[PDB]
Design a protein around this ligand. Sequence first.
Ligand SMILES: Cc1ccc(C(=O)Nc2cccc(C(F)(F)F)c2)cc1Nc1cncc(C(N)=O)c1
Length: 275
Amino acid sequence: TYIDPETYEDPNRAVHQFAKELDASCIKIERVIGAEFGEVCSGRLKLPGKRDVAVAIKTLKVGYTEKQRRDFLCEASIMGQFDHPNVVHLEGVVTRGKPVMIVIEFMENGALDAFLRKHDGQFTVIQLVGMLRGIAAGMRYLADMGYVHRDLAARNILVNSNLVCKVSDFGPVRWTAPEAIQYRKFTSASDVWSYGIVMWEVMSYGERPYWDMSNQDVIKAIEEGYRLPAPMDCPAGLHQLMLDCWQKERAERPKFEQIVGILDKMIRNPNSAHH
Ligand SMILES: Cc1ccc(C(=O)Nc2cccc(C(F)(F)F)c2)cc1Nc1cncc(C(N)=O)c1
């Protein structure tokens, strides 16, 4: 089961429990790939006897306080509790004595929303469904561990060379269930609403949910019963599942295990996605 690292009297204890300390000299930074806390780089990590693995390296820019280090490292305390093929994997951390780092499996194709926009129209229904199935499997794992994501969005899904999609978080009214927006009720059931939004993002190749509508106009429309339509070439049964994820009454939304089951049926018989 997931443990909130902030139930720990000392935040550093959580870091040392769930995140392996790495030797800095075994880490090679190669290129900058992103700009919070510091730069994000790609590189390699040396493993004894094994070939080097490609990693993403999140750095803590120098001049930080004790306090800033704490919040940065909290992420490793969270990540390192998970072990699932559709949840991004923590290799480890450098916490003292050397430049502070979080070291993560490298995901070549980056964030799923930008990836899809770049490859607009290039994936078959079955391929897009495989991507959604991976995300759903990652969420099913997280939900079962008692972890509520709270910011599930295609921008928070990472893609590797093999098109495998993994749940991540880069640290959002249009992705959020109404009960979470209004009453701050964040649960796996509110993550299911977010997932429905992710489904829409994927089937539309990284279009912005609700396009140019203001946050207040999104909230109002949702309250009035508005729901986003099926994207171009999106089968009716996939859109129906989006509609199910977007039920006002959270108890009526499917569970992730049911979502995976439904997508599996679609991968097994592609025709059952239209009905
Ligand atoms: C640099 C980076 C930063 C944050 C994360 C990440 O997913 N962090 C995270 C934070 C809180 C919770 C979770 C979790 F695992 F989803 F629950 C993940 C991953 C990465 N890894 C990564 C790997 N490959 C490419 C990139 C990129 N292109 O930015 C980024």
